[PDB]
Amino acid sequence: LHAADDMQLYKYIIKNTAWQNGKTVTFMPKPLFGDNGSGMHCHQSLWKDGAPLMYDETGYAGLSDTARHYIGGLLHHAPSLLAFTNPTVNSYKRLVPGYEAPINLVYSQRNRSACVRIPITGSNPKAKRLEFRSPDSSGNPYLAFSAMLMAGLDGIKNKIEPQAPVDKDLYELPPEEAASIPQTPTQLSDVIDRLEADHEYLTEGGVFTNDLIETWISFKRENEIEPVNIRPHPYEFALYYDV
Amino acid sequence: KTPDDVFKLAKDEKVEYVDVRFCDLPGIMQHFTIPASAFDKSVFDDGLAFDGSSIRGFQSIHESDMLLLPDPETARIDPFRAAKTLNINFFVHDPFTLEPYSRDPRNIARKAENYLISTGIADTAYFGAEAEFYIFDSVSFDSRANGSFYEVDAISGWWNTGAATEADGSPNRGYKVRHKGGYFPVAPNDQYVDLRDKMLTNLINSGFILEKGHHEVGSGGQAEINYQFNSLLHAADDMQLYKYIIKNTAWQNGKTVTFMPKPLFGDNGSGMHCHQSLWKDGAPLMYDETGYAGLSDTARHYIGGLLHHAPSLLAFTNPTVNSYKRLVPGYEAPINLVYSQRNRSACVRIPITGSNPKAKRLEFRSPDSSGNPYLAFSAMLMAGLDGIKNKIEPQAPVDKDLYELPPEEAASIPQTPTQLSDVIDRLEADHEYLTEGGVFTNDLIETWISFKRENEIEPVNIRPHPYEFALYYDV
Amino acid sequence: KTPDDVFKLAKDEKVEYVDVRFCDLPGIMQHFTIPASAFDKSVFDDGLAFDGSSIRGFQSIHESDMLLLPDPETARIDPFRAAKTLNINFFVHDPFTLEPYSRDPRNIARKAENYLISTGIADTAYFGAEAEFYIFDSVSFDSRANGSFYEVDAISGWWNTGAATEADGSPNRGYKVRHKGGYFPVAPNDQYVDLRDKMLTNLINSGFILEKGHHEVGSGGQAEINYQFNSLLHAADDMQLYKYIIKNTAWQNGKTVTFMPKPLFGDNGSGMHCHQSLWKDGAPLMYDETGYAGLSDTARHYIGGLLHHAPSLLAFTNPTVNSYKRLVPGYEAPINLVYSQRNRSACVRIPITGSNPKAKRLEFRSPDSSGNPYLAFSAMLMAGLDGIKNKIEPQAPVDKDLYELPPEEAASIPQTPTQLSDVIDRLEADHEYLTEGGVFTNDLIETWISFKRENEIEPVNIRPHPYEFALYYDV
Amino acid sequence: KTPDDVFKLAKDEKVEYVDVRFCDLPGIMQHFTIPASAFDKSVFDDGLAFDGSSIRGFQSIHESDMLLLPDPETARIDPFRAAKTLNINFFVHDPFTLEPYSRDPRNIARKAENYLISTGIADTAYFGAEAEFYIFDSVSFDSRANGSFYEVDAISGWWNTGAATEADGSPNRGYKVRHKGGYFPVAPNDQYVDLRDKMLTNLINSGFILEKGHHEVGSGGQAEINYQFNSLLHAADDMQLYKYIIKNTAWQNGKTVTFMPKPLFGDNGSGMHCHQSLWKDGAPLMYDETGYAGLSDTARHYIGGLLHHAPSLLAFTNPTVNSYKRLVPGYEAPINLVYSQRNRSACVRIPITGSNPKAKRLEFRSPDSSGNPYLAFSAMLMAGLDGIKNKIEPQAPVDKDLYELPPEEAASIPQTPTQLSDVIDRLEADHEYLTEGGVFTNDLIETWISFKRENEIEPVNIRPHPYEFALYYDV
Numbered sequence A: 001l002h003a004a005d006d007m008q009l010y011k012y013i014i015k016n017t018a019w020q021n022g023k024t025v026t027f028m029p030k031p032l033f034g035d036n037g038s039g040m041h042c043h044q045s046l047w048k049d050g051a052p053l054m055y056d057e058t059g060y061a062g063l064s065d066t067a068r069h070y071i072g073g074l075l076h077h078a079p080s081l082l083a084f085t086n087p088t089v090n091s092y093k094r095l096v097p098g099y100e101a102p103i104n105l106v107y108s109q110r111n112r113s114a115c116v117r118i119p120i121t122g123s124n125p126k127a128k129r130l131e132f133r134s135p136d137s138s139g140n141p142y143l144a145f146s147a148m149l150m151a152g153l154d155g156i157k158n159k160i161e162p163q164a165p166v167d168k169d170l171y172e173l174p175p176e177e178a179a180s181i182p183q184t185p186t187q188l189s190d191v192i193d194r195l196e197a198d199h200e201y202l203t204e205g206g207v208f209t210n211d212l213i214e215t216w217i218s219f220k221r222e223n224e225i226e227p228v229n230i231r232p233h234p235y236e237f238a239l240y241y242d243v
Numbered sequence B, C, D: 001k002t003p004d005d006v007f008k009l010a011k012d013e014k015v016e017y018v019d020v021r022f023c024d025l026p027g028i029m030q031h032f033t034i035p036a037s038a039f040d041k042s043v044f045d046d047g048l049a050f051d052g053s054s055i056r057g058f059q060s061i062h063e064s065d066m067l068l069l070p071d072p073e074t075a076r077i078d079p080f081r082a083a084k085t086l087n088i089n090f091f092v093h094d095p096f097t098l099e100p101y102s103r104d105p106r107n108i109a110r111k112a113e114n115y116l117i118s119t120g121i122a123d124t125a126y127f128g129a130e131a132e133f134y135i136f137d138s139v140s141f142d143s144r145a146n147g148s149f150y151e152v153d154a155i156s157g158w159w160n161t162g163a164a165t166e167a168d169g170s171p172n173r174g175y176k177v178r179h180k181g182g183y184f185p186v187a188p189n190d191q192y193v194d195l196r197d198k199m200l201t202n203l204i205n206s207g208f209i210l211e212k213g214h215h216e217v218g219s220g221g222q223a224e225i226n227y228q229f230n231s232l233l234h235a236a237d238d239m240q241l242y243k244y245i246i247k248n249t250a251w252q253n254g255k256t257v258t259f260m261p262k263p264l265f266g267d268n269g270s271g272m273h274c275h276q277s278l279w280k281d282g283a284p285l286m287y288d289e290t291g292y293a294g295l296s297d298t299a300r301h302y303i304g305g306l307l308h309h310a311p312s313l314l315a316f317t318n319p320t321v322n323s324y325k326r327l328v329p330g331y332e333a334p335i336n337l338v339y340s341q342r343n344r345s346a347c348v349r350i351p352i353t354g355s356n357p358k359a360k361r362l363e364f365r366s367p368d369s370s371g372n373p374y375l376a377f378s379a380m381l382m383a384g385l386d387g388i389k390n391k392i393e394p395q396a397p398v399d400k401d402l403y404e405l406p407p408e409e410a411a412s413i414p415q416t417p418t419q420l421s422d423v424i425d426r427l428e429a430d431h432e433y434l435t436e437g438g439v440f441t442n443d444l445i446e447t448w449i450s451f452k453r454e455n456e457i458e459p460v461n462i463r464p465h466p467y468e469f470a471l472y473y474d475v
């Protein structure tokens, strides 16, 4: 909660500091074509009674079972989770290869091409965490943070095993190997459809309620997805004016 | 028509050049010119070479050389070139075996007509098309790292009612067309009467048999011209020539034409409605006085095929990203897969034609002009034939304004696809009806899928839409 | 043709002026004009004088006077000059001895044809050339202490899709040509149909035998016109006249043409592909039904010569700095020294011509139009003949897209040279094949090496490239 | 200096932010900022993380995380930032093993100094550098399909003597600098006196020990500032900080500085002359009263190394394409590999310093500022040390204007390399002197070769030069 409050205030301060100095700031995921998008990477860890739970010296990338299952939750629920972590049409213009954003659902240490990176933090158990690189700033940090937690917790509860880490530049995978790893969703309508179909992990404990989820789905369809869909894109003119 | 007929025409018409034409895979006609002196029997016997690697959907660079052989049926005098020119369409052939090319669109049409005959169902498929278009004054567009735009303009566009002067500096004289109001008030509200007359005349003088011309619904110069129906291949050839004549008549008169499905947002798109009928031994097969909308079983099953195969069929009938911007409610284009008589909101309309059995046909309203009529016409036939063969029953006609259906009733009828990537995915998954008789071959279908993904779908997907900035700049 | 034939032509055509033409070393035709009254037997017997010190690669100032003697074969009526004019090419001769000039390009061609005969290998070398060019609207450029630029422009250039208006202020009407997409959609996408027709007509009226004309791959008006092949010297004369006719047809119609190898970055260069064959006693020597791509031993060894001598040969076939901007992968120009049938990525392509022995030939794709066809054609023949004489075996053909070869495979193949300085260095080191029979002389070769170094290589080397500012301003 | 010294400085100076700095492979300093509150022991013990995949010549994306550890010797207050800031340079380390990074330029300098000690030849290498630069008013440049340009501008540039007004509209008041005439007339001809004073003051206030400042030869604002020599690593750190100070002093005063080797054509380039000497146990090793130009055997052999290894050494000392535009005759830069006392046309000059042994040194005139001083200095030392170890004798000194040498005498001396690709090819072929003691490692050398080819050499090669249009548009 504090972190989400911090995020909202941070945006306000960044935007208005710029404004007062004759500039203008955007946190949109992808305002430039052919250059890096803007992410909101979320470093996450769970603690109990003042002790860290993420660390196990014997695990891949120093990760405990609890940590590994949390990742399993994130990567497993991704096709619906992104409806809150990547909630805009513009979000999906960032999820393209070559710009240090994810294009598939894998975790890997030290890996800025991956969906979940495990940063190199040495043997200090307090520093161990996962970096969920998928999310952006185009939505609601209260909902985004909460949704990630619910996915992560469902993973722990169900001991969901993530698929083996891939320690490779994921934008450079051979076609055959690439096709075998689940891709990030292509567009917002896909994740909204998926959220609508499958969202039980969010409704656990009544954290998200059906009325929230329905309003979200409905809002995104009517105010974002559809309005973009009906409007001809300028590149269609480059492509098709002379058909 | 024979080679000697064409030589006589060239001689009689004092032709200086012969323009050798053929069709690329996406649907744009290609050409080069040879002098009259080089137009001889050798052209019919040996054919002519070209670079297949520079033509879309054709060859790779290391297998580049391809061959062309003329189709004497297609010889027309060019109405535009100051040096008297005879245009002729060619078939693409392999340079080694001299076999027809598997990715020549004109070959696909050929194969389609032969397959029809081989089924015994009919011997002729007639296609009547309505290729709508916009007569614009100007267009510009670009795509850069930090921005992108397009703009179309037209003197008669409603967006110009408040202009202080016309583009040339002359006064604004009003009589501009309202959105959805171009169909079809008299001049001066119709500002394109003389230009369309020139289009009609140029068509007539190229041997077209004309039926009508008019302003269409869209503001800013939408138009429609209709010519007589014909058998599949001839009809596709007619379509390609018609586009060439429309575009260049406009060009020569200081205008610019587009056949893109949806160049205006909030006004009508441009369709290519296809009126279809099957005939055998000079008798029509579509009519049965006792059927809904006077339709025979053969007709009804043909419709069943179209509506059933629609989710893949549209990959050829609606082959562009822009296509899907037209398939939205409120503009006399389809939004779901139903047939209905008299119904301009439906996917297949049955026009009111009375009891004359020769006039009975279905109007497939889904297709547009953004692709390849050889492939589109052929694909519709294959879907239609599969329907007859499998006696596919279309779901009951819905005689209602389909844009106004109650939500519960709407959701129960299959919708038209949302986007090109959907129909390409579906084509890839299920396309057996097209491969029947080898009309479409796997290499054609794979090249098509591959071309559309790499050159159209993906390039649009990666580029931020301007409306995203309206939506999200301030997130 | 005789002196008396030319006089008759002048008389019959009511010629007012005779344009006396010859070729400078680099490859630009030179001229001066004499009145009809001054065109007499004396011109054939005594010849005409000019200042050899003002012509590039010719004489020094203190040895300036040179002589010209006419070549009756080359007489054509000028299609452009309002005062009726007969053009005639001349041979450069020493004013004292009357011997042919060792640095007259036309003399080198002459000597080449004779040498061929003297070898007994063949009696005729046929050259078919494709001189590609760009039809631009404008060009400007400069070079100063503190900056430098160039800009070419063309209405059909893709870079202009976003322009608010055309250069003359008229509206942007679209139909511009996509990069790599000019080959070869119909009008209005092809914006140069009527202009190219004028070019074709002018060529016809100057006695060219035409084969085809078309828009080429490149955006912004790339074009190609083909005329019938001929023997070496006649072919080189044809080439020079063709460039003159193309450039001046464009000029008279408000356009501006360049034959430079690579005026556009990231689009197709302009080549001068040379189709070559040897004949003896009226029979073709290139064909053998049992050889790879139907090629005889003589043909194969000719290709062996070309590919073997490439590292020096390109000094005449690819003689400019800009030449080497074209020899880059992805644009249907060569990047390594292989031959292959049907293959537009190869250095020598064998076009698909069937079993007709008269049609069998090799296409040497390396050369461009940026130099001297007299020297280029001759140099190719000398390389080809050295190959036959020494039975040089070309390395095995590689029937693959040569731009897409796996790393190990690519590195096993000799690459085309990177830059002009490399081929000049190599020519200097090894050029014996050119000096055979005295076809090229050491003084010609030294002058060439010297000219290129001092006037082209060095002047480019010393001037900062704009892209260095992009790269390095902030170091 | 210790960690506790730096903390005291930060506390005493009321620092708000610490700027964490390190060097990329090509030679540009990188930075991020941390608050004063985050600057603690932890920074020295654990270090700080960054994305090694966004830094040139560093890591791939899947091995991105890298670590930085501070160098307390480099702590300086920033003279520019309104929020009081302390700048510190860091070493790049492996995040797992905590070993120094093989491709950290600062580590290379570290290793070089240790290697020197380990040879027993000397214990200290002193570097005195002269980084010349231009104070311009503006720059722009671009590179498109149909054109490309650059322009630099400066109020005092000779090209502006005819300007009706200054850029801001104020009158042209003359006193502009003649090409090759900036060294060094008094104001107002020297228009940059006050600005260079501001540069001198900013350097002084960052703890530099100053020696001189002046206008340099080149028109349009060329300048030079000298600070006291130092040992290799410290000298490289000094250089980087100097460029930062010069660039930002200019920036804050409405100007723009470039250290590129040759921004002006036909006027002096900007060099980075390196005065070098070796010392052991506090005593100089370069001096011998009986040697040519007062040079010892150790000194002579060091020169022998430099001149002998030049063909590959210049890959680090002259590392850009633009570097080779400076190595042309007539501008006080080298064009061949000779040493000579008092000689500003030579590759190695021996400055006239009298009989004081402490002052004896060589001036290596070849290097420029377009790369990486850490690498450049280190590479020079390695070449010099190899010379000493192998007792490499330099060819006899030539006490002449080496620009004016007749062509025959000039050939009998090895020339400087013509272009970057030559030195890269040579480095690739022969680099064992650099790998001695593991100072340069094969992975560094390979990355360097690779980076220069793909990011500099090739991108320049494929882009048409404006002067090619001057040369060839009309071919």
Ligand SMILES: CC(C)(C)c1nc(-c2cnc3ccccc3c2)c(-c2ccncc2)[nH]1
Binding pocket: B126, B127, B128, B129, B130, B211, B226, B227, B228, B229, B275, B276, B277, B358, B359, B360, B361
């Ligand atoms: C040109 C268009 C699309 C209006 C059209 N007119 C016709 C048309 C209209 N009236 C007719 C009356 C009688 C006979 C044929 C007719 C064809 C047909 C058509 C197409 C395919 N099969 C049969 C008819 N299509």
Ligand SMILES: CC(C)(C)c1nc(-c2cnc3ccccc3c2)c(-c2ccncc2)[nH]1
Binding pocket: C126, C127, C128, C129, C130, C211, C226, C227, C228, C229, C275, C276, C277, C358, C359, C360, C361
């Ligand atoms: C004009 C061009 C380059 C297309 C060309 N056509 C030809 C060409 C094409 N077809 C032919 C068919 C038969 C006879 C000669 C032919 C020449 C040749 C050529 C050149 C050299 N030697 C032989 C042929 N070149």
Ligand SMILES: CC(C)(C)c1nc(-c2cnc3ccccc3c2)c(-c2ccncc2)[nH]1
Binding pocket: D126, D127, D128, D129, D130, D211, D226, D227, D228, D229, D275, D276, D277, D358, D359, D360, D361
């Ligand atoms: C700053 C520059 C380049 C002019 C310079 N001054 C000096 C310089 C000049 N005079 C000196 C007199 C005495 C002692 C040292 C001196 C150094 C040196 C130098 C560099 C390396 N090794 C020795 C000297 N370099």
Ligand SMILES: C[S@](=O)(CC[C@H](N)C(=O)O)=NP(=O)(O)O
Binding pocket: A036, A037, A038, A039, A040, A041, A094, A099, A100, A101, A112, A133, D051, D054
């Ligand atoms: C350098 S980056 O890898 C770039 C991230 C990119 N903008 C993104 O879209 O996530 N981010 P960081 O290293 O700060 O986590």
Ligand SMILES: C[S@](=O)(CC[C@H](N)C(=O)O)=NP(=O)(O)O
Binding pocket: B130, B132, B183, B217, B224, B268, B269, B270, B271, B272, B273, B326, B331, B332, B333, B344, B365
């Ligand atoms: C008037 S309309 O119904 C309009 C058709 C619309 N432009 C379409 O997109 O199909 N066409 P028609 O009546 O000519 O068949």
Ligand SMILES: C[S@](=O)(CC[C@H](N)C(=O)O)=NP(=O)(O)O
Binding pocket: B050, B051, B054, C130, C132, C183, C217, C224, C268, C269, C270, C271, C272, C273, C326, C331, C332, C333, C344, C365
């Ligand atoms: C289409 S192309 O292959 C293009 C050749 C290219 N301009 C070049 O040689 O650089 N030429 P051709 O007319 O020989 O088919």
Ligand SMILES: C[S@](=O)(CC[C@H](N)C(=O)O)=NP(=O)(O)O
Binding pocket: D130, D132, D183, D217, D224, D268, D269, D270, D271, D272, D273, D326, D331, D332, D333, D344, D365
């Ligand atoms: C006056 S100069 O000789 C000029 C050097 C020139 N700018 C160069 O090295 O390229 N420099 P200095 O005398 O300061 O060593």
Ligand SMILES: [Cl-]
Binding pocket: A089, A187, A188, A189, A190, A225
């Ligand atoms: Cl969407």
Ligand SMILES: [Cl-]
Binding pocket: B321, B419, B420, B421, B422, B457
């Ligand atoms: Cl799509």
Ligand SMILES: [Cl-]
Binding pocket: C321, C419, C420, C421, C422, C457
């Ligand atoms: Cl060169």
Ligand SMILES: [Cl-]
Binding pocket: D321, D419, D420, D421, D422, D457
């Ligand atoms: Cl280079």
Ligand SMILES: [Mg+2]
Binding pocket: A041, A131
């Ligand atoms: Mg991060």
Ligand SMILES: [Mg+2]
Binding pocket: B130, B224
């Ligand atoms: Mg109609």
Ligand SMILES: [Mg+2]
Binding pocket: B130, B132, B216, B224
């Ligand atoms: Mg209509």
Ligand SMILES: [Mg+2]
Binding pocket: B130, B273, B363
């Ligand atoms: Mg209709």
Ligand SMILES: [Mg+2]
Binding pocket: C130, C224
């Ligand atoms: Mg050709």
